[PDB]
Amino acid sequence: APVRSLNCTLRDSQQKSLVMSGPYELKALHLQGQDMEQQVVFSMSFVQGEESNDKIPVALGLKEKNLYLSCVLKDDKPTLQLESVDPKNYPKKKMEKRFVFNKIEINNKLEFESAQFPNWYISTSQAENMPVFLGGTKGGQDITDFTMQFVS
Ligand SMILES: NC(=O)c1ccc(NC(=O)[C@@H]2CCCO2)cc1
């Protein structure tokens, strides 16, 4: 059958919202009121992959855009990028591994681990208006926990 998808927003555990501000540039900042329209709406697809009660493989596309978060090596490091795809062919149930995140539920928060790069996570900085990135530890000063808001 098709792939199943939900519209949603994400906020980091310091309640920073995610926005587009540059061509392929997703950023995290404190947002409230009128400016909350600026936040990115995701289409979260439930994709093929290894699954358990609290670890669910997803892809994160931008709503009604042929753009997906992906994990690739850049200048020899696991990095987060926005990648364009053929809009005729996406989303699909069997997403390529660079597109797959394990959505992990721990203590009423979510983490998004790269399926491609184990123990690398979607991360934000504590500072305002810095890139969303792939961080190689769910420890330290960087933020690896999120909440999801379901959107119409
Ligand atoms: N110097 C640049 O032209 C440039 C800098 C940063 C970005 N993107 C990111 O850092 C991505 C955004 C999705 C996750 O991380 C894109 C372009």
UniProtKB/Swiss-Prot annotation:
Site (Important for interaction with integrin): residue numbering on this chain: K55, K63, K65, K74, K88
Induction: By LPS. Transcription and translation induced by M.tuberculosis and a number of different M.tuberculosis components in macrophages; EsxA is the most potent activator tested (at protein level). In pancreatic islets, release is increased by high glucose treatment. In pancreatic islets and macrophages, release is also increased by endocannabinoid anandamide/AEA.
The entry's keywords: Cytokine, Cytoplasm, Inflammatory response, Lysosome, Mitogen, Pyrogen, Secreted
Main localization, broad class: cytoplasm
Keyword Cytoplasm belongs to the record: yes
Compartments, as annotated in UniProt: Cytoplasm, Cytosol; Secreted; Lysosome; Secreted, Extracellular exosome
Site feature Involved in receptor binding, where: R4
Motif (Involved in interaction with TMED10 C-terminus): 112-125
Coiled-coil annotated spans: none
Record function comment: Potent pro-inflammatory cytokine. Initially discovered as the major endogenous pyrogen, induces prostaglandin synthesis, neutrophil influx and activation, T-cell activation and cytokine production, B-cell activation and antibody production, and fibroblast proliferation and collagen production. Promotes Th17 differentiation of T-cells. Synergizes with IL12/interleukin-12 to induce IFNG synthesis from T-helper 1 (Th1) cells. Plays a role in angiogenesis by inducing VEGF production synergistically with TNF and IL6.
Additional observations: The IL1B production occurs in 2 steps, each being controlled by different stimuli. First, inflammatory signals, such as LPS, stimulate the synthesis and promote the accumulation of cytosolic stores of pro-IL1B (priming). Then additional signals are required for inflammasome assembly, leading to CASP1 activation, pro-IL1B processing and eventually secretion of the active cytokine. IL1B processing and secretion are temporarily associated.
Oligomeric and partner information: Monomer. In its precursor form, weakly interacts with full-length MEFV; the mature cytokine does not interact at all. Interacts with integrins ITGAV:ITGBV and ITGA5:ITGB1; integrin-binding is required for IL1B signaling. Interacts with cargo receptor TMED10; the interaction is direct and is required for the secretion of IL1B mature form. Interacts with HSP90AB1; the interaction facilitates cargo translocation into the ERGIC. Interacts with HSP90B1; the interaction facilitates cargo translocation into the ERGIC.
Family: Belongs to the IL-1 family.
Protein name: Interleukin-1 beta
Positions spanned in the full protein: 117 to 268 of 269
